[PDB]
Symmetry: C2
Subunit: 212 residues, 2 copies
């Protein structure tokens, strides 16, 4: 009647409800026992995410879960005999929702603005782009972002004028050739990709003005 922590992944597909664990009281030998659960996700909102079979004691989940909505449920199980007397003290059940990589990284803006002096030596820091990821950055790689440049417009004097640091999102002058007179602004297409650059991804824009 001890109960260990319980885990469920989010976004489970398939037939519902699904078994989590069978609750049991020792007093089952001396009398007939009925089981119940209380708390948010049980008898309070969100009602009915978790249910328990009153006779067998099977705790179940009734629907897919979403770790970015609710990462943890605290429930309580109850054990009542047919005479109407509690035969256990209500027992705490902790349900942890585990993560799936179901969120694309997301830039903090959709157009970032920076500027750079045409005279800047190659390897001069220009500006910083940034993305966030709603997935579990503490236990997984589902939120580990890597920045990349996708395209540059215009592609002149050539098409690698700038570079981005994949960890920090800092954009730097890659090569010399910046000519305000001949092209006054560059528009980069930047990409954030999770799983260390290898996962889901999104894009945004960075607009670079060449100063005097």
């Amino acid at each position: 009647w001890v109960i260990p922590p319980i885990s469920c992944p989010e976004n489970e597909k398939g037939e519902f409800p699904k078994n989590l664990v069978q609750i049991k009281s020792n007093r089952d030998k001396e009398t007939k026992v009925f089981y119940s659960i209380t708390g948010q996700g049980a008898d309070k909102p969100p009602v009915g995410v978790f249910i328990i079979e009153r006779e067998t004691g099977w705790l179940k989940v009734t629907q897919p879960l979403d770790r970015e909505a609710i990462a943890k449920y605290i429930l309580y199980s109850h054990a009542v005999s047919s005479n109407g007397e509690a035969v256990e003290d209500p027992m705490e059940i902790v349900i942890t929702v585990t993560d799936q990589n179901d969120n694309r990284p997301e830039f903090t803006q959709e157009v970032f603005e920076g500027s750079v002096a045409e005279g800047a030596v190659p390897g001069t820091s220009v500006m910083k782009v940034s993305a966030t990821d709603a997935d579990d950055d503490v236990n997984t790689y589902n939120a580990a972002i890597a920045y990349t440049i996708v395209s540059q417009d215009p592609e002149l004097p050539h098409k690698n004028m700038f570079t981005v640091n994949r960890d920090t999102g800092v954009i730097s002058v890659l090569t010399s050739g910046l000519d305000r007179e001949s092209y006054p602004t560059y528009t980069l297409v930047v990409q954030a990709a999770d799983l260390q650059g290898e996962g889901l991804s999104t894009t945004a824009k960075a607009v670079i003005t060449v100063k005097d």
Copy 2:
């Protein structure tokens, strides 16, 4: 002394080892107990994926797991007094590895080949591409594949000569205008992505020959 099933996600990061569950014998009261585990993942290959502190009974996992290598471990715990008599019947512990989308889909071939009659009416089935995904297709969407066409070469008489059913991978003639004399073959770059098209992806080629 009964152990509910245990879950652990694959590819966990952070410090190791990590607590799973505290095992304990009741006779803990009468005498001092030492705790042990056996099985594949404990004392047999893979040795040491799971360990247990012998006095506290804390069962731990020592490294990241990989569902696609081993999805399920069966271990036994043991409880021996300091007098050297077993104080519990060995307990089966089932550890379930839950999946992460950490496998790109994989085309069954690098280059698929097909043919079509230039007279073929738009909507004519041509050929089929196929891919598999090593992730968990029973419980998750991490292996749910959608097929798209990425590019066509040549892009003549225009670029959407064909189309692909996103569920079946059946490529079909989309428009009229096939002309063997001018454009004898098409090279299609096809893509398979999981999370129903929204996820990890790979590409392969489909070369279509235009027949009389």
